[model samples]
Each structure stands twice: as C-alpha cells, then as structure tokens.
Target: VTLFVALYDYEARTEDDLSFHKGEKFQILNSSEGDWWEARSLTTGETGYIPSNYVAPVD
Candidate 1:
C-alpha cells in the first residue's frame, strides 16, 4: 500500500468515512477516480474516504 501524510485535519461528512488529523500518516487503499480517495489511517487502522488534496506523499 502507498503511504501518505495528511497536511491538515479532515472531518468526515458521513459515517461511512473516518476522521483524520494533521500530520497523520495513512495507507492509500484506492483512488480509482475523482477527488476523493480511500485510505486507512496509520494511527488508528480505520478505513475511510479522504480528499486527495488533503494529503501529500510521504517524501
């Protein structure tokens, strides 16, 4: 799985998603299309949808 670091906190609008905080790392699970991507939080191991722009590559 691809790793990513969140640039800022992302709050979920629905229960189908998970919330994440700034500087948190996540595992990219999917990004087939659109601006939203599926990811798993490294800190919590929770899966959810996050905006593609909300994070950056681990570097």
Candidate 2:
C-alpha cells in the first residue's frame, strides 16, 4: 500500500544539486525515521531517499 500519491510530479534534490523526477505512485520503501524515507519511482524505477516533508499520507 502507498501512503501518498503525488498531487503533481516533483523533483528529488540532494545537497549537491543533483535531481531526479518523482512521479505518481512512488511507494515508500522505508519510513522508520520521521523526516526521511526511502522510495522508488514507479515510472522510472529509480530508488533512493526522499524527504517525508514533500509527501503526505495516503488519506
């Protein structure tokens, strides 16, 4: 189950200015921590850490 679906696609950016596309249905891989989570893009098959701040719950 997914907690949230992107209202609109967004970008993932790190401290180095690297970015990746975050699309719809990006499922949470891990969310043990409060602010950080591991997720994967259903469209691109890319997986990494995303800020929980950008994502909202499935409800």
Candidate 3:
C-alpha cells in the first residue's frame, strides 16, 4: 500500500472521480494508466481515480 498526499483541492466531475483537498492522505490502489490513478482516501474512505500530478508521495 503506497501513501500519497494531495497537492491541491480538486473538484471531480464524475462518479468515478475523487474529490480531495490539499494535505489529505490517500492510498494508491492502482496506477496502470499514464496520467490517472486509482486511490482510496484515508480520511473519508472514498475510492476513485485522481490525476497523477495532483498528488505527491508521502514523505
């Protein structure tokens, strides 16, 4: 399980999209695509796809 932090707030347009805020933590579930990844939110327990550039590795 890889952990990441949201770089900024995102407003999702679809049901499969994840809306998150800055400083939020997420678990990277899958990343077989080029730009988007499947992640689960640690705070809200929501799961969806998020932009790769929108998040950064947890340090």
Candidate 4:
C-alpha cells in the first residue's frame, strides 16, 4: 500500500511544501528526503514536499 492518509492539516509553509487536510489521502513517492518527502496530493496529483511523519498509512 503506497497510500497515506492525513491525520491533520499541514498548511504549506513554502512554495515547495505540500499541504494536507484532515482525512485527505496522499501518495508518498520518495522518502529519501528524510524529514520531508516528495508526494502527490489527492487533490489534483500535484507533487510537493510533505512531512515524513505527518502522514500515516490509511489502514
């Protein structure tokens, strides 16, 4: 399962940052970035950086 569901909102702090909304599911693409990983949002598949620990598995 490559899907991760947002447990809370994480408003983008920078242009390269990915924003997450409560219950919004996102796809983690690259976790090699350490604290922040590259991902695609469920909103429109826009790719950006999101906190590695901010998202958790859907189930």
Sorting all predicted structures by TM-score, with the top scorer first, yields: 3, 1, 4, 2
Write down the worst ten-residue block by lDDT for model 3: 50-59
Local accuracy of candidate 2 as per-residue lDDT tens digits, 1-59:
55665554446456523245434566666757575565566576756655547656665
Clashing pairs in 4: none
The local lDDT score (0 to 100) that residue 4 gets in candidate 2 is 64
Q: What would the TM-scores of all predictions be?
A: 0.65, 0.52, 0.68, 0.64
lDDT string for model 3 (1-59, tens) is 36776677778888878677777676656757656776676567777776767455754
Candidate 3's C-alpha runs over 4 A off are none
Please provide, for model 4 over 1-59, each residue's C-alpha lDDT reduced to its tens digit, 9 standing for 90 to 100. 87876677666778888675665566656756467776666667777776757556854
* Clashes per candidate, residues 3 or more apart or on different chains: 0, 1, 0, 0
Q: How far is candidate 3 from the true structure (C-alpha RMSD, Å)?
A: 2.3
* Candidate 2 to native Cα RMSD, angstroms: 3.4
Candidate 1 lDDT over 1-59, as tens digits, reads 35776676667779877677766676655757666677666567777765757455754
RMSD of each: 2.5, 3.4, 2.3, 2.3
| Model 1 lowest lDDT segment of ten | 50-59
What ranges in model 2 sit over 4 Å off? Answer: 7-23
Candidate 2 — what's its lDDT? Answer: 0.56
